[PDB]
Every structure is written in structure tokens, then in C-alpha cells.
Amino acid sequence: DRICTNCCAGTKGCKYFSDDGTFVCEGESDPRNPKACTLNCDPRIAYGVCPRSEEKKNDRICTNCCAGTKGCKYFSDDGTFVCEGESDPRNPKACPRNCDPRIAYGICPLA
Helix, strand or coil: CCCCCCCCCCCCCCEEEECCCEECCCCCCCECECCCCCCCCCCCEEEEECCCCCCCCCCCCCCCCCCCCCCCEEEECCCEEEEECCCCCCCCCCCCCCCCCCEEEEECCCC
16 A cells, blocks of 8 residues: 555554654654544555553453363462353354453363
């Protein structure tokens, strides 16, 4: 597509940078506020690197009594068992329990 980006009607959060291997500016227009630049388009830009450095380490405890696995006893960190993961082979179901933080693991029967 056309590289019609601009430092004015950008997206405050991403540091607009140029393909030449050099930075430019940051979005002057936040996806929050309105804007009326009307100039637009700047081939200088390539994209805009939005800083985060914390995207990872969040899913971690994505275990749950609902969408877990039918075979393990999804148990909670509180030192108490919750229930078995009710996620059957190709199970059409998804509770608000998606990645239950309150859980800890899923203790399956050690045969």
C-alpha cells in the first residue's frame, strides 16, 4: 500500500521512524483526540515503533477448569483443587475462565 503516513495525523504511542534506519517523530495525533492535519503522506516514514518491553509474561497461567484439558485436575494456587479441565477434543466452549489466574496447575492422575 501507499506509505501515506505523517508525523501530524500519526498515532501518539508509536515513535514514527524512517526506513533509512533513522528515527523521525512520534504520533502527534493520539487515537483518543480528534485531528485536522489534512497534509498527510510522508514517504520518509516506514512505520512507528511503539515501546512496551512487557508484552511477554502475562499468558503464563493460562490454565483453567473450563478450557483446560479433560484429564488433568485443574487446581488452584490457594492449595485447593478446583475442577478437571473441561476442554474435550475439539470442544465448542469458552468460559470467562479463559486463562484462569486463580488456578495454579492441572494435576493429572499419575498412572
